[PDB]
Amino acid sequence: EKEWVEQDEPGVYITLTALAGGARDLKRVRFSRKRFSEIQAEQWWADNRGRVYEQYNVRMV
Amino acid sequence: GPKWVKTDSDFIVLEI
């Protein structure tokens, strides 16, 4: 079960998983407090959720 | 959840 982190926008780090090169899953998104307030991080997720699922090839169930 | 975790001083975490 591979698990890794991708650099997204500055201050946004996305953890993905896959088993043996199978379908990918989105495990978590980490936001730097250097770059994000809690209000900003919530708004970011609303604005970027669809792009994150498409770009990183995670089925948006 | 997704659930927000706000206890860390360096990061906010959205646990999917």
Residue numbers in the entry:
A (entry chain A): 1006 to 1066
B (entry chain B): 272 to 287
The authors write:
Here, we identify RCC1-like domain (RLD) proteins as LZY interactors and reveal that RLD is a regulator of polar auxin transport that controls the abundance and localization of the PIN protein in various developmental processes including GSA control. Structural analysis of the complex of CCL domain of LZY and BRX domain of RLD, which are responsible for the direct interaction of these proteins, reveals hydrophobic and electrostatic interactions at the interface of the anti-parallel intermolecular β-sheet. We also demonstrated that the CCL domain of LZY and the BRX domain of RLD form a complex with high affinity in vitro and that they are necessary and sufficient for the recruitment of RLD from the cytosol to the PM. Our results prompted us to propose a model in which LZY3 recruits RLD1 to the PM of the columella cell in a polarized manner according to the direction of gravity following amyloplast sedimentation.
We found that the BRX domain and the CCL peptide form a 1:1 complex with a KD value of 9.7 nM. To elucidate the structural basis of the interaction, we determined the crystal structures of the RLD2 BRX domain bound to the LZY3 CCL peptide (referred to as the RLD2-LZY3 complex) at 1.35 Å resolution. The RLD2 BRX domain adopts a compact α + β structure comprising an N-terminal three-stranded antiparallel β-sheet and C-terminal α1- and α2-helices. The LZY3 CCL peptide is folded into a β-hairpin structure and docks into the hydrophobic groove between the β3-strand and the α1-helix of the RLD2 BRX domain by forming an antiparallel intermolecular β–β association between the βB-strand of the CCL β-hairpin and the β3-strand of the BRX domain. This results in structural extension from the three-stranded β-sheet of the BRX domain to a five-stranded antiparallel β-sheet in the complex, which creates an additional hydrophobic core comprising nonpolar residues (Trp275, Ile283, Leu285, and Ile287) from the CCL β-hairpin and the surface nonpolar residues (Leu1031, Val1034, Phe1036, and Trp1050) from the BRX domain. The complex is also stabilized by polar interactions and the electrostatic surface potential of the BRX domain is complementary to charged residues of the CCL hairpin. At the interface, salt bridges between charged side chains from the CCL hairpin and the BRX domain are formed (Glu286-Arg1033 and Lys277-Glu1047), and the CCL hairpin loop is stabilized by Arg1038 from the BRX domain. Our mutational analysis suggests a dominant contribution of hydrophobic interactions to the complex formation and the importance of Arg1038-mediated stabilization of the hairpin loop. Here, we have provided the first structural basis for the BRX domain as a protein–protein interaction domain that forms a 1:1 complex with LZY CCLs. The BRX domain is folded into a compact globular structure, although it is composed of only ~60 residues.
